[PDB]
């Protein structure tokens, strides 16, 4: 199910005990993808030996990010994921499976982790896979 | 802003290092309320010295809950919050402020913490107040 594109295992969400990424939720999306986001945020907090960890895709841009971005939701869900799709950084449709996709430096030099699939279910599977990998 | 109804300070979300509540997200709602939910889940995870901590309001009922429920979203957002509103346990409208409302035993004997306000902003304020209180 879960396609690991890029070096996902190398994507660090914690450095010491301080989070290295925002969790960007699709504002134009289902409450499911962001249930995923909440579970991911729970995982990160668990690993947190500042600011809202979770934000909306209307409150962050790739060009202005000062840290890594975990995009939760596909192009139909997350505006930033769509921006990445409208630029060939990611190719994702309704037919796309659960996907953890690292785009290097897509956010103002900082790496991006797209956690998304074709539908809500696939996004949730990808989030769950990320949680399993973080342990 | 944040109305503390009931004994909110006494609402324990962690017992030792294992979460005592679900975080129930309004499926029929804004991605903002559940950005709140994700931030709350981050807080809980931080305090976590099993299952998805965050769920949707379509995946849990009050009558079947086996633990505390943190409802995120007002009656317009969270189906369980509406059920509580359609029963006088909570009274919440567009005019309602940011609110942390403990309903004792509303979920099959387990207590419920409504984290919600009149609009998205108020829900987020209530979530932030809960986070500050948990520390």
Numbering used by the authors:
A (entry chain A), B (entry chain A): 23 to 71, 492 to 577
From the paper:
High-resolution experimental data confirming the proposed assemblies at the atomic level is very scarce. Based on our predicted models of Viridibacillus arvi and Methanococcus voltae, we designed constructs (see Methods section) containing only the domain responsible for the formation of either the 4-fold or 2-fold axis. H Proposed assembly of Methanococcus voltae (gray) with the 2-fold symmetry axis of the anchoring region is shown in orange. Aligning the crystal structures with the SymProFold models revealed a great similarity, with RMSD values of 0.65 Å for V. arvi and 1.38 Å for M. voltae, further confirming our predicted assemblies. The SymProFold prediction of S-layers from P. abyssi, M. voltae, T. camini, T. thioreducens, and M. vannielii, even though different in sequence, size, and domain structure, show an analog domain arrangement as the crystal structure of M. acetivorans SLP and reveal a dimeric anchor, which has not been described previously. For S-layers from Vibrio aerogenes, Paenibacillus naphtalenovorans, Pyrococcus abyssi, Methanococcus voltae, Thermococcus camini, Thermococcus thioreducens, and Phocaeicola vulgatus, no experimental data on the unit cell parameters, structure, or symmetry are reported.
The S-layer is built from one or more (glyco)-protein subunits, S-layer proteins (SLPs), that self-assemble into a highly flexible and dynamic lattice through an entropy-driven process, allowing for structural adaptation in response to changing environmental conditions. In this study, we introduce the SymProFold pipeline, which utilizes the high accuracy of AlphaFold-Multimer predictions to derive symmetrical assemblies from protein sequences, specifically focusing on two-dimensional S-layer arrays and spherical viral capsids.
